[PDB]
Ligand binder design. Sequence first.
Ligand SMILES: CNCCN(C)C(=O)c1cnn(C)c1C(=O)Nc1ccn2cc(-c3ccccc3)nc2c1
Ligand SMILES: [Mg+2]
Ligand SMILES: [Zn+2]
Length: 316
Amino acid sequence: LMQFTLPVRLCKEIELFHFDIGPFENMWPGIFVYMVHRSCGTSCFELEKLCRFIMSVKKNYRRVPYHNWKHAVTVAHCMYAILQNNHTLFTDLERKGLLIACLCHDLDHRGFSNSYLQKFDHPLAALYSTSTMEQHHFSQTVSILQLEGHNIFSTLSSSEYEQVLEIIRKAIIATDLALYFGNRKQLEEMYQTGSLNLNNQSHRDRVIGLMMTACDLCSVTKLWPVTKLTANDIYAEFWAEGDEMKKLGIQPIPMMDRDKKDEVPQGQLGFYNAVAIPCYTTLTQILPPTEPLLKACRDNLSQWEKVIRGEETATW
Ligand SMILES: CNCCN(C)C(=O)c1cnn(C)c1C(=O)Nc1ccn2cc(-c3ccccc3)nc2c1
Ligand SMILES: [Mg+2]
Ligand SMILES: [Zn+2]
């Protein structure tokens, strides 16, 4: 066999939740295949079809500051770390589906929220009334899977193919943060009443949904220099959207107004308290080995507090 291998530092550090995939774009396909081979198996996919699939997915991500090809592979790496540290808990189809779902979860993102597409009256908003961009990301995934020589699931039965596409659809839709609040609340109530049941498919769907949020937000679980620099890319998009809202004659929300840049540290503190900490808290309760994501999130919360107190300086 031809096994994928990484340099010694990457081989060790890729197993860490806080791993950064680095600035060499040409290494990310190899990093992804390496993670598929270890988390799924060398027989899960035909290498030729998987490589062709990866390069078509890359081509359908756009040159935007944050929702780009690097984000796709970064979210996949976080899923890899969750799967490898919980390897008894997931099925063969979930291992085949979830790294692919992560790679594809923001396909053809233009750096604009569902709200902006609604206000602009974009054709996508007419086609998909809720989770507009996420329904688009899934449609783009199906289009690529149906290209000649791109059926990476060709050895699955019709019923198994339908199952894995359902895992991918639900996982991509779960990255709509509007749906996270309800999903985490349901999971919190289920865990605390001891009703949570990983044999229940509707429960598995919710746990996978929370895993997808955890992976999607994972910049907050990196080492501080990575967290701080990624925040610059996130705001580059938010502020471009705020400019476009102002062009429509609509006041943007504070996080999208570039004139409010001095309030970013307090905005981050608000986001960590309201979204990130609860997300990784609930995930650790369900999957204790994901603890390092929560620890790293708490460490970054403390860094943003230091910035607010003027002990740290967050420059753009
Ligand atoms: C997942 N899709 C949803 C979009 N998205 C990618 C995220 O929300 C996301 C993902 N990772 N991170 C780190 C974030 C993030 O930073 N979010 C927020 C969330 C709320 N805010 C409020 C203020 C703020 C700024 C200035 C003034 C007042 C308020 N700033 C923020 C920032
Ligand atoms: Mg998205
Ligand atoms: Zn994303």
